[PDB]
Structure formats: structure tokens, C-alpha cells
Amino acid sequence: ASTTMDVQSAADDTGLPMLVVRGPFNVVWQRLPAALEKVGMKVTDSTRSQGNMAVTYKPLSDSDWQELGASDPGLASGDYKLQVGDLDNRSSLQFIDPKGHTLTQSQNDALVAVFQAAFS
Ligand SMILES: [Cl-]
Ligand SMILES: [Cl-]
Incomplete structure (x- = not known):
């Protein structure tokens, strides 16, 4: 089997979108920075005890999304908190x-394919 981790869209307890990934916090926290880099997300600061990463997102070119195997998920460029x-x-x-x-x-639905690619 491979290093991919399953990723699914879900909602939080107030009904707002989030992704659920099939591995524990310790694994997903450690994997995230290199996975995020693949999809144009740079970690600029993080706090593991609070579970929070600050990311700056630069979308891939049309051809790079093609290489990755997911299309532009329609996120705006710039800063996010994860x-x-x-x-x-x-x-x-x-x-x-x-x-x-x-x-x-x-x-959030579009990011499912993006993150399945990133973790592969
Ligand atoms: Cl850069
Ligand atoms: Cl850390």
C-alpha cells in the first residue's frame, strides 16, 4: 500500500465546512508542511499546542495543477489559517x-482532490 491518506469533506458541529483526514493528529500535523508545499501553501508560523498553522497560498499555474492531478480549487490567493x-x-x-x-x-469539496494529491 501507499503513503496516501484518505480525505473527505465534512461539517463541523456548527455546520461549517471542513476536511476530515484518515490519520491521527500526530501524523497529520507532521505530514502537513511538506504536503502543503506541493499545493502552493507555505507555512509561515505554527503552534502545535493550539493546532494552528498560518499559511500563505500561491495558486499553481494551470500546468502545475495538471501535474499534481487536481484543478485550481477556487481558493483566493493570500493568507489562511489552518x-x-x-x-x-x-x-x-x-x-x-x-x-x-x-x-x-x-x-472545501474542491480541496478533497487537492489534498489527496498532496499526501500522495
Ligand atoms: Cl516562495
Ligand atoms: Cl511543530
Whole structure:
């Protein structure tokens, strides 16, 4: 078997979109910086005890998305915060803009393929 980790779209306990990834916090936290780099997300600061990563996102060119194997997920370039939650054998990933806005269901849905590619 491979190093890929399963990724699914979900909602948090208030109904807002997030991703759920099939491995524990300790694994997903450690894998994230190099996986994020593949999809144009640079970690600029992080706090593991709070589960939070600050990311700056530069979208891939049309050809690079093609190489990765997912198309541009329709996220705006710029800064995001990524919150990594402990769900025992799984982890949650929830992106916010700097105003605290969560992704749309469509963006969050589009990031499922992006992150399955990044972890591969
Ligand atoms: Cl750079
Ligand atoms: Cl760390």
C-alpha cells in the first residue's frame, strides 16, 4: 500500500465546512508542511499546542495543477489559517480566511482532490 491518506469533506458541529483526514493528529500535523508545499501553501508560523498553522497560498499555474492531478480549487490567493483538530484516528482540517470566514462547501469539496494529491 501507499503513503496516501484518505480525505473527505465534512461539517463541523456548527455546520461549517471542513476536511476530515484518515490519520491521527500526530501524523497529520507532521505530514502537513511538506504536503502543503506541493499545493502552493507555505507555512509561515505554527503552534502545535493550539493546532494552528498560518499559511500563505500561491495558486499553481494551470500546468502545475495538471501535474499534481487536481484543478485550481477556487481558493483566493493570500493568507489562511489552518486548524488541525484531534478526532482520535482521524484529524480535521478547517481553513479560514483572516476575517475568520470558512471556505464555501464548493471550495472545501474542491480541496478533497487537492489534498489527496498532496499526501500522495
Ligand atoms: Cl516562495
Ligand atoms: Cl511543530
